[PDB]
Amino acid sequence: EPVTIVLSQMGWVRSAKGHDIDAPGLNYKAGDSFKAAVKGKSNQPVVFVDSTGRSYAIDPITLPSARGQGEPLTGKLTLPPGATVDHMLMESDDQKLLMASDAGYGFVCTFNDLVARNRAGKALITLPENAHVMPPVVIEDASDMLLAITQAGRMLMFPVSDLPQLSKGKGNKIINIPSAEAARGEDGLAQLYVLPPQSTLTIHVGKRKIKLRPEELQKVTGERGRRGTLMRGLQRIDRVEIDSP
Amino acid sequence: SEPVTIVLSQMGWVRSAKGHDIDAPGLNYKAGDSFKAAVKGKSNQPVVFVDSTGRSYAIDPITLPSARGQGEPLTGKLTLPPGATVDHMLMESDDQKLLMASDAGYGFVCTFNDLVARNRAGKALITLPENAHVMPPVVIEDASDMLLAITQAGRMLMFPVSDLPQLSKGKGNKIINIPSAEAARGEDGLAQLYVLPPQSTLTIHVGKRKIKLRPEELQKVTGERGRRGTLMRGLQRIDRVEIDSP
Amino acid sequence: ERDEVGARKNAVDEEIERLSQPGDQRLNALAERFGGVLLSEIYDDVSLEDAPYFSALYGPSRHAIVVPDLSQVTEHLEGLTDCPEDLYLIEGDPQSFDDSVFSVDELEKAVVVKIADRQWRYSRFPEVPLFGRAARESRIESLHAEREVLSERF
Amino acid sequence: NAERDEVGARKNAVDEEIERLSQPGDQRLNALAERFGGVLLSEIYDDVSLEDAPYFSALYGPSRHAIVVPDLSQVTEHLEGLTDCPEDLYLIEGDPQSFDDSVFSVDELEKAVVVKIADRQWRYSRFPEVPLFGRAARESRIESLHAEREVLSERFATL
């Protein structure tokens, strides 16, 4: 059966039947509210990634219905002190994924690599000083390009296949960001995409729009782990529109 | 019958040379005299002269002196109005259509035969308004061709030459509108007068600039006969006009 | 003993003078009257590093007025004399503006724009760029707030 | 006093025009043109009439200040490091002695010009009170006016 697992802001979860659920409009306890939702199947394990970079797996069947307030994840999971669950995933066991930190390090892995039954989960991705976990990216096509944009406004593109595949760890650097700067929030991974090579991006920066055609994206293609290319007026991105045939 | 080149000098002397390949400018002229104009034709067809007053005359080439000598005064056969000079010569078919006009902006269509007058005094072909001058006669190679008028003020008007009424004389009808008082004072007048196919391109050289008018641009200038015309920016004091006709 | 602060103060006074360094109102009045927004205002947020580049890039059209609908301007053009000899008008959204297309060859501290096969425009990076005013004024605030903190330490 | 009033009026009118044509309208462009092996566009249009001068000046917009060169490949080498010039330097390829007027999509008003730069961009250029173009003809007119003023002044003094 198709289900929609809902996570509240205070770390409460519940399993709603179907995918027509209005999660934000659900009933949350006082002071609590919607945080995230994920759509999957009842036979599919739901994966949780906490703020420290650990992954956990829970069988949806064991979760309470969305008819109640739900239950605290602490009931089934033991997270590091002060940690919170920031990401949920439900994909096929073989589904290729892109894990990364905002320090510019990351690796390609499989959904199965995140599945940790034990309540303490597993150390999936290691975070450098003051680094944060990036939103994991689902790799639809093994031939897609990896696109990275830094806070400083630098871009780098290369086949996602170039990024070494790991089951855990800090990973290798996607784009070159000075470790010292990253640890001070002076620079870092601002955006991370995996998309077809003939894609067109429309980037919203304040009251301006920067349109990058496949031709422009070509000029920023290079080797994994490089600087790489500095863009004009591409800091403080508000929104990114991606057109991919 | 025999190919001939009729040569006219500045002082009004004329001679009939043999052949159509002669160096007219490089010829023997009376002291102070020099080449003015030349026209190519046959020995059996008449040569027409047009003087500065707008009168036309015709002379049988057979009666003219060979180019072996300096020739003969045109006054020998023709009687011109006082102070008049011969400015233009023509040798065309009798039925050849011509465009006659004055720089006052008036003219008419006629045939070569209309200019043929064998009497000494000739005929009053075109009537000139005050201080007006005769325009260079234009040979209409195609009845469906376009007449193009350019004024000294820089106005252009183009219409089918077939639109201009056909006459044998004298003043003709309005080609393009120029206030008569301005024409009589030399403040404005006909600067250029052409008859060419619709699909033509003009290259007008004005000082250090040039203006290229594609067929599509001349279309803009197209209108009805006798109209004021379109004032062109920086089209005064033209130095040269190139014409490309397919 | 300690001329580090005295030297730093001078450095702050240096940049402050350069940023606030001199140096149109008519375009503003025309903008609101056209129901549009100055391109310079749309580009007031660009950094100190990119401001010179963008200002140069746009050429004279940097002074342009952006309106969502050009038909708003038409009625005003006839008889309009209270304006610069060249007035640029670009149709676009002042909230989400699409940049103009430029065939550009970027040099150091300058750009070469190909306007047509027979026309080039060389625009060097200007001191006191038109664009990036907002970011420039902010930087001046930081410098002031820093200069006073240096003055107490002086 | 028919004649004196007529002479006095024309004399004033002359002073009007002279002052209007002499009123204040960089030589860096002159030096650049020489270095580039070209000539100023304004020089090429120095022959245009007093009537047409403001039109053409407005028509070309800012590129009015352009340097015309026979071959643009001459200029590239001088561009890098070039700071001694206006913030916008226009370079047009063409024959200075036989220059074809640039093509413009223009709606002519009075006394201004609306040029369509692109599908979403227009340029409104009002006729300048003192045009950059037609300087040769303008100076020629000013000179003749001065010659006429002395004639009028002589006659006005005599009556």
PDB file of C-alpha atoms in Angstrom, chain A residues 33-144:
ATOM      1  CA  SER A  33       4.246  21.966  12.861  1.00  0.00           C
ATOM      2  CA  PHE A  34       5.078  20.362   9.520  1.00  0.00           C
ATOM      3  CA  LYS A  35       8.713  19.774   8.671  1.00  0.00           C
ATOM      4  CA  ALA A  36       8.973  17.196   5.918  1.00  0.00           C
ATOM      5  CA  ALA A  37       7.124  14.453   4.137  1.00  0.00           C
ATOM      6  CA  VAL A  38       8.092  11.533   1.906  1.00  0.00           C
ATOM      7  CA  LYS A  39       6.031   9.328  -0.412  1.00  0.00           C
ATOM      8  CA  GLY A  40       6.688   5.600  -0.704  1.00  0.00           C
ATOM      9  CA  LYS A  41       5.282   2.099  -0.268  1.00  0.00           C
ATOM     10  CA  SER A  42       4.439   0.054   2.840  1.00  0.00           C
ATOM     11  CA  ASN A  43       7.032  -2.590   1.944  1.00  0.00           C
ATOM     12  CA  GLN A  44       9.674   0.085   1.377  1.00  0.00           C
ATOM     13  CA  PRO A  45      11.845   1.057   4.361  1.00  0.00           C
ATOM     14  CA  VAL A  46      11.854   4.749   5.271  1.00  0.00           C
ATOM     15  CA  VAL A  47      15.317   6.243   5.784  1.00  0.00           C
ATOM     16  CA  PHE A  48      16.164   9.109   8.132  1.00  0.00           C
ATOM     17  CA  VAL A  49      19.322  11.215   7.987  1.00  0.00           C
ATOM     18  CA  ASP A  50      20.116  13.274  11.080  1.00  0.00           C
ATOM     19  CA  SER A  51      21.989  16.574  11.314  1.00  0.00           C
ATOM     20  CA  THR A  52      25.247  14.805  12.229  1.00  0.00           C
ATOM     21  CA  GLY A  53      25.221  12.728   9.051  1.00  0.00           C
ATOM     22  CA  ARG A  54      23.911   9.456  10.462  1.00  0.00           C
ATOM     23  CA  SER A  55      21.299   7.346   8.673  1.00  0.00           C
ATOM     24  CA  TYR A  56      18.509   5.237  10.169  1.00  0.00           C
ATOM     25  CA  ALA A  57      15.903   2.878   8.722  1.00  0.00           C
ATOM     26  CA  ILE A  58      12.394   2.130   9.977  1.00  0.00           C
ATOM     27  CA  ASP A  59       9.698  -0.168   8.610  1.00  0.00           C
ATOM     28  CA  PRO A  60       6.605   1.986   7.860  1.00  0.00           C
ATOM     29  CA  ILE A  61       4.258  -0.745   9.109  1.00  0.00           C
ATOM     30  CA  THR A  62       5.518  -0.198  12.661  1.00  0.00           C
ATOM     31  CA  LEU A  63       4.573   3.489  12.497  1.00  0.00           C
ATOM     32  CA  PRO A  64       1.296   5.010  13.791  1.00  0.00           C
ATOM     33  CA  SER A  65      -1.389   6.352  11.438  1.00  0.00           C
ATOM     34  CA  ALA A  66      -1.654  10.036  10.514  1.00  0.00           C
ATOM     35  CA  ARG A  67      -5.008  10.039  12.301  1.00  0.00           C
ATOM     36  CA  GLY A  68      -3.218  10.523  15.620  1.00  0.00           C
ATOM     37  CA  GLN A  69      -0.577  13.048  16.684  1.00  0.00           C
ATOM     38  CA  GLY A  70       1.937  10.390  15.674  1.00  0.00           C
ATOM     39  CA  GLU A  71       4.890   9.370  17.827  1.00  0.00           C
ATOM     40  CA  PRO A  72       8.351  10.725  18.724  1.00  0.00           C
ATOM     41  CA  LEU A  73      11.178   9.228  16.655  1.00  0.00           C
ATOM     42  CA  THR A  74      13.067   8.878  19.942  1.00  0.00           C
ATOM     43  CA  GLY A  75      10.849   5.864  20.576  1.00  0.00           C
ATOM     44  CA  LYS A  76      12.548   3.924  17.789  1.00  0.00           C
ATOM     45  CA  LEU A  77      15.755   5.890  17.230  1.00  0.00           C
ATOM     46  CA  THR A  78      18.649   7.026  19.399  1.00  0.00           C
ATOM     47  CA  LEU A  79      20.207  10.172  17.945  1.00  0.00           C
ATOM     48  CA  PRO A  80      23.404  11.951  19.024  1.00  0.00           C
ATOM     49  CA  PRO A  81      22.914  14.683  21.660  1.00  0.00           C
ATOM     50  CA  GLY A  82      21.277  17.756  20.135  1.00  0.00           C
ATOM     51  CA  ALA A  83      20.855  16.106  16.739  1.00  0.00           C
ATOM     52  CA  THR A  84      17.672  16.278  14.672  1.00  0.00           C
ATOM     53  CA  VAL A  85      16.328  14.390  11.665  1.00  0.00           C
ATOM     54  CA  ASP A  86      16.511  16.692   8.649  1.00  0.00           C
ATOM     55  CA  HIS A  87      16.036  14.309   5.721  1.00  0.00           C
ATOM     56  CA  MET A  88      13.822  11.364   4.768  1.00  0.00           C
ATOM     57  CA  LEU A  89      14.136   8.989   1.818  1.00  0.00           C
ATOM     58  CA  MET A  90      12.105   6.172   0.290  1.00  0.00           C
ATOM     59  CA  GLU A  91      13.674   4.705  -2.843  1.00  0.00           C
ATOM     60  CA  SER A  92      14.364   1.320  -4.418  1.00  0.00           C
ATOM     61  CA  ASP A  93      17.175  -0.575  -2.697  1.00  0.00           C
ATOM     62  CA  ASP A  94      19.367  -0.100  -5.780  1.00  0.00           C
ATOM     63  CA  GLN A  95      18.601   3.616  -6.134  1.00  0.00           C
ATOM     64  CA  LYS A  96      21.805   5.595  -6.660  1.00  0.00           C
ATOM     65  CA  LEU A  97      22.122   8.652  -4.422  1.00  0.00           C
ATOM     66  CA  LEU A  98      24.393  11.673  -4.029  1.00  0.00           C
ATOM     67  CA  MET A  99      25.482  12.421  -0.470  1.00  0.00           C
ATOM     68  CA  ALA A 100      27.438  15.573   0.352  1.00  0.00           C
ATOM     69  CA  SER A 101      28.290  18.172   2.984  1.00  0.00           C
ATOM     70  CA  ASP A 102      28.318  21.937   2.474  1.00  0.00           C
ATOM     71  CA  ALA A 103      32.098  21.841   2.895  1.00  0.00           C
ATOM     72  CA  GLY A 104      32.147  20.584  -0.684  1.00  0.00           C
ATOM     73  CA  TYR A 105      32.784  16.915   0.056  1.00  0.00           C
ATOM     74  CA  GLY A 106      30.560  14.073  -1.096  1.00  0.00           C
ATOM     75  CA  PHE A 107      30.196  10.624  -2.614  1.00  0.00           C
ATOM     76  CA  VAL A 108      27.809   8.508  -4.662  1.00  0.00           C
ATOM     77  CA  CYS A 109      26.090   5.621  -2.906  1.00  0.00           C
ATOM     78  CA  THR A 110      23.036   3.372  -2.949  1.00  0.00           C
ATOM     79  CA  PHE A 111      19.814   3.621  -0.933  1.00  0.00           C
ATOM     80  CA  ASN A 112      20.705   0.257   0.617  1.00  0.00           C
ATOM     81  CA  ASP A 113      23.807   1.925   2.070  1.00  0.00           C
ATOM     82  CA  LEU A 114      21.597   4.178   4.195  1.00  0.00           C
ATOM     83  CA  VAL A 115      19.483   1.324   5.541  1.00  0.00           C
ATOM     84  CA  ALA A 116      20.532   0.813   9.162  1.00  0.00           C
ATOM     85  CA  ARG A 117      18.073  -1.237  11.219  1.00  0.00           C
ATOM     86  CA  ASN A 118      19.795  -0.665  14.569  1.00  0.00           C
ATOM     87  CA  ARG A 119      18.336   2.186  16.619  1.00  0.00           C
ATOM     88  CA  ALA A 120      21.670   4.031  16.715  1.00  0.00           C
ATOM     89  CA  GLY A 121      21.805   4.070  12.916  1.00  0.00           C
ATOM     90  CA  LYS A 122      25.097   4.302  11.041  1.00  0.00           C
ATOM     91  CA  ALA A 123      27.690   7.004  10.420  1.00  0.00           C
ATOM     92  CA  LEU A 124      26.907   7.731   6.775  1.00  0.00           C
ATOM     93  CA  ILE A 125      28.668  11.003   6.001  1.00  0.00           C
ATOM     94  CA  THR A 126      31.369  12.646   8.104  1.00  0.00           C
ATOM     95  CA  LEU A 127      31.036  16.401   8.628  1.00  0.00           C
ATOM     96  CA  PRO A 128      34.062  18.734   8.767  1.00  0.00           C
ATOM     97  CA  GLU A 129      34.120  21.554  11.336  1.00  0.00           C
ATOM     98  CA  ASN A 130      30.828  23.488  11.287  1.00  0.00           C
ATOM     99  CA  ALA A 131      29.758  21.673   8.114  1.00  0.00           C
ATOM    100  CA  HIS A 132      26.157  20.690   7.410  1.00  0.00           C
ATOM    101  CA  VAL A 133      24.572  17.798   5.532  1.00  0.00           C
ATOM    102  CA  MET A 134      23.346  18.688   2.044  1.00  0.00           C
ATOM    103  CA  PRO A 135      19.890  17.619   0.878  1.00  0.00           C
ATOM    104  CA  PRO A 136      20.579  14.155  -0.556  1.00  0.00           C
ATOM    105  CA  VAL A 137      20.059  13.996  -4.322  1.00  0.00           C
ATOM    106  CA  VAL A 138      18.385  11.126  -6.170  1.00  0.00           C
ATOM    107  CA  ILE A 139      20.374  10.196  -9.279  1.00  0.00           C
ATOM    108  CA  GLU A 140      17.821   9.397 -11.988  1.00  0.00           C
ATOM    109  CA  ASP A 141      20.306   8.664 -14.772  1.00  0.00           C
ATOM    110  CA  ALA A 142      23.855   7.391 -14.274  1.00  0.00           C
ATOM    111  CA  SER A 143      24.812   9.589 -17.236  1.00  0.00           C
ATOM    112  CA  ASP A 144      23.560  12.836 -15.692  1.00  0.00           C
TER     113      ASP A 144
END
